[PDB]
Amino acid sequence: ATSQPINFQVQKDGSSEKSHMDDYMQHPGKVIKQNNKYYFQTVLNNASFWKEYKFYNANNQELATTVVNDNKKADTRTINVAVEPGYKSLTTKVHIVVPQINYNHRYTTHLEFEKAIPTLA
Ligand code: HEM
């Protein structure tokens, strides 16, 4: 396995402004290459709030996500999002539910990588 840190910023639909969703993901992220796949690995803060999350490439096909750890006490979740070299921008569609404030909303954002996903060894 080969891995390296990658900077990213979740941005509002239709804007380069920082999205509220960015505030619920740890920075930096990670790109991992393994047998023969690439993953953007990221940590969701307050994972209990993320009722649904889907990711898409710029050409609008859904990217497979997997759960690498689920940490119930810290309320975090580490996930892998299948990516390819060259990917610059992911579209995300999320369903966020915060029961204690009667909050139930759905959103679209775009997750912007600082540099395109690199080719790795
Ligand atoms: C108790 C926790 C939270 C509170 C109090 C809260 C509050 C808000 C508020 C006030 C807005 C403004 C809506 C608008 O201007 O139309 C908003 C929108 C939004 N929220 Fe949250 N939110 C919370 C949790 C989350 C979580 C966990 C996520 C996902 C990681 C999230 C992602 C978004 C997104 C994507 C928008 C639409 C505009 C944007 O991209 O920033 N929020 N929320």
Swiss-Prot record:
Q: Which residues are involved in binding heme?
A: 12, 19, 103
Positions of transmembrane segments? none
How is this protein used? A combined vaccine containing IsdA, IsdB, SdrD and SdrE afforded significant protection in mice against a lethal challenge with S.aureus Newman or any of the clinical isolates NRS252, N315, NRS248, USA100 and USA400. The immune response elicited by the combined vaccine is greater than the one elicited by its individual components.
Provide a Gene Ontology MF annotation, just one.
metal ion binding
Hydrolase as a keyword? no
Q: Which residues form the NEAT domain?
A: 1-121
Where in or outside the cell it occurs: the entry states:
Secreted, Cell wall
Name the GO cellular-component terms: extracellular region
Expression induction per the record is:
Repressed by fur in the presence of iron.
Keywords from the named record:
Cell wall, Heme, Iron, Metal-binding, Peptidoglycan-anchor, Secreted, Signal
- Record comment regarding domains: The NEAT domain is responsible for binding Fe(3+) and Fe(2+) heme and fibrinogen. The NEAT domain is an inhibitor of apolactoferrin activity, while the C-domain confers resistance to bovine lactoferricin.
Any idea what job this protein has? Cell wall-anchored surface receptor that participates in the extraction of heme from oxidized methemoglobin/metHb to enable growth on hemoglobin as a sole iron source. Receives heme from IsdB and transfers it to IsdC. Also plays a role in the inhibition of host immune response. Protects S.aureus against the bactericidal protease activity of apolactoferrin. Decreases bacterial cellular hydrophobicity, which renders S.aureus resistant to bactericidal human skin fatty acids as well as to beta-defensins and cathelicidin.
Question: Which family is it part of?
Answer: Belongs to the IsdA family.
The record's note on quaternary structure and interaction partners says: Monomer. Interacts with IsdC. Interacts with IsdB.
Q: What is this protein called?
A: Iron-regulated surface determinant protein A
Quick one: which gene encodes this? Answer: isdA
Portion held of the full protein = 64 to 184 of 350
